[PDB]
C-alpha cells in the first residue's frame, strides 16, 4: 500500500496473509470461518499446492503476539474464464483445512447480496484497501498492515481520466502517483461501509504501482456473488486446485 497508514491492530480483522514456503505471496479476505477470497493470479506459479498457508489475526510480521491463526489451504477455486498471466476474472475462493476461531482480531467481512452490492454499495464513493505490500513503487514491503481510503470511479470516467477495464473490474484510487495498492497487496480486500457494517466489494488485482495517470484496478466482486455462494455449498474435491465453471 502506497500513501496509506498503519491499520490499527484489530481494525482490519478480515485481512488474510497468504504464505508459500513461509514467504509472503498475497493478501486475502475472510468471508466465513473456512472461506477466504483472494486473486486468481496469486496462484499462477505455485509448484507445491500443499505448502500454501493462510494467516488470520496478523498485524506486525516481525513478532508473534498470540492473536495469529494459521491454516492450511485445502482448496483453491478459480473461475474457468480466468487465463493465467492476465487480469480478467481475477478471483479465487480458498477453503481452509480447519475453521478459524472468531475473536476480537479475526472476523469475516460480509459478502453482500448481488442486488445490494450493485444498487447500493457500488455508489458509496470511498472504500478501504489493505495489505502488507510495497510501500513505494520499487520499494520494500510493509511489516505492519497498511490501509488506504480510495474513491471508486465509474468505468467511463476511469477511461477518460486515465493518461482494458472489463465489466468484471472497476477502477479506484488516484491518478497523481501518491496513493495506490501495490505488489504484495493483491488478493486483499476492497471493503465498503454502509450503515454500520462493512462489505466485500473488490479484490486488489494487478498490475505499475502508484503510476501517474493511472488508477488501481480491482476485481468487481458483485459479478461473482452467485458463483461464490454456490461453491461454498459444495463438497470439497481431492486435489487443491479446482477450476469451476463461470458463470
Amino acid at each position: 500500500i502506497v500513501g496509506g497508514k498503519v491499520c490499527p491492530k484489530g481494525e482490519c480483522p478480515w485481512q488474510v496473509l497468504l504464505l508459500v514456503n513461509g514467504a509472503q505471496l498475497c493478501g486475502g479476505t475472510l468471508i466465513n470461518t473456512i472461506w477466504v477470497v483472494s486473486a486468481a493470479h496469486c496462484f499462477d506459479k505455485i509448484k507445491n499446492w500443499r505448502n500454501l498457508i493462510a494467516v488470520l489475526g496478523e498485524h506486525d510480521l516481525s513478532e508473534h503476539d498470540g492473536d495469529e491463526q494459521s491454516r492450511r489451504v485445502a482448496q483453491v477455486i478459480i473461475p474457468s474464464t480466468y487465463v493465467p498471466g492476465t487480469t480478467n476474472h481475477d478471483i479465487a475462493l480458498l477453503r481452509l483445512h480447519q475453521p478459524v476461531v472468531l475473536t476480537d482480531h479475526v472476523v469475516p467481512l460480509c459478502l453482500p447480496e448481488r442486488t445490494f452490492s450493485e444498487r447500493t454499495l457500488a455508489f458509496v464513493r470511498f472504500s478501504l484497501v489493505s495489505g502488507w505490500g510495497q510501500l513505494l513503487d520499487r520499494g520494500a514491503t510493509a511489516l505492519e498492515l497498511m490501509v488506504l481510503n480510495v474513491p471508486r470511479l465509474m468505468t467511463q470516467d476511469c477511461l477518460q481520466q486515465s493518461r482494458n477495464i472489463t465489466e468484471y473490474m472497476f477502477c479506484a484510487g488516484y491518478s497523481d502517483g501518491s496513493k495506490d495498492s501495490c505488489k504484495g497487496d493483491s488478493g486483499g480486500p476492497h471493503a465498503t461501509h454502509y450503515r454500520g457494517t462493512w462489505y466485500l466489494t473488490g479484490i486488489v488485482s494487478w498490475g505499475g504501482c502508484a503510476t501517474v495517470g493511472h488508477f488501481g484496478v480491482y476485481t468487481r466482486v458483485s459479478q461473482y456473488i452467485e458463483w461464490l455462494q454456490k461453491l461454498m455449498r459444495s463438497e470439497p474435491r481431492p486435489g487443491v486446485l479446482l477450476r469451476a465453471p463461470f458463470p
Binding site: 484489530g10 476480537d104 472476523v107
Partner: protein, 56 residues
C-alpha cells in the same frame, strides 16, 4: 419504497415483491427488528463489524 432507491429503506438486503411491497433481510448472524428495516447482531462476531470499535 423500492429497493433501487435508498436501498428500500433497508439497513442491509432488500427484495421487491408483487405490488407496493418490499421485504428487508439481514445477513447470517443478524436478525431483523420490528421496524422491518434494521438488523441487529445475534452472535458475538457478526460479519463486517470491528469488535474493538464496537466495544469502544
Amino acid at each position: 419504497l423500492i429497493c433501487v432507491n435508498e436501498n428500500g429503506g433497508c439497513e442491509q438486503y432488500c427484495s421487491d415483491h408483487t405490488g407496493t411491497k418490499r421485504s428487508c433481510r439481514c445477513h447470517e448472524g443478524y436478525s431483523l427488528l420490528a421496524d422491518g428495516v434494521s438488523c441487529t447482531p445475534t452472535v458475538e462476531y457478526p460479519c463486517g463489524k470491528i469488535p474493538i470499535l464496537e466495544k469502544r
